[PDB]
Amino acid sequence: YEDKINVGGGLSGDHCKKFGGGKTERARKAMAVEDIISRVRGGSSGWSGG
Amino acid sequence: EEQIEAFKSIIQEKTSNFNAAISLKFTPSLHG
Numbered sequence: 001y002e003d004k005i006n007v008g009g010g011l012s013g014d015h016c017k018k019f020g021g022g023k024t025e026r027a028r029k030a031m032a033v034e035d036i037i038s039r040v041r042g043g044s045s046g047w048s049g050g
Numbered sequence: 051e052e053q054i055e056a057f058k059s060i061i062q063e064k065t066s067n068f069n070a071a072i073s074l075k076f077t078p079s080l081h082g
């Protein structure tokens with residue numbers, strides 16, 4: 001403002017923020033157990049055993 | 051079998067600006 005005495009003044013501020021976050025987690029587990037046992041009382045020592 | 055994976059990502063930013071515009075002029079010889 002000025003009146004004919006002058007007084008001067010001026011201000012201008014600017015602020016800005018930019019935040020970011022990201023997370024990723026992946027798990028994969030597999031377990032398999034297979035057992036096959038055959039008891040044969042056929043009567044063959046070697047050939048029956050095979 | 052076992053398998054696991056993990057990912058993470060983070061970004062941060064912060065701006066700032068501060069103007070200042072002030073002028074003085076006076077004239078009622080005298081001048082300012």
Ligand SMILES: *[C@@H]1O[C@H](CO)[C@@H](O)[C@H](O)[C@H]1NC(C)=O
Pocket residue numbers: 012013014066067068069
């Ligand atoms: C100055 O003022 C302008 C307009 O109001 C604004 O966009 C800017 O962020 C300010 N600061 C600067 C240019 O540093």
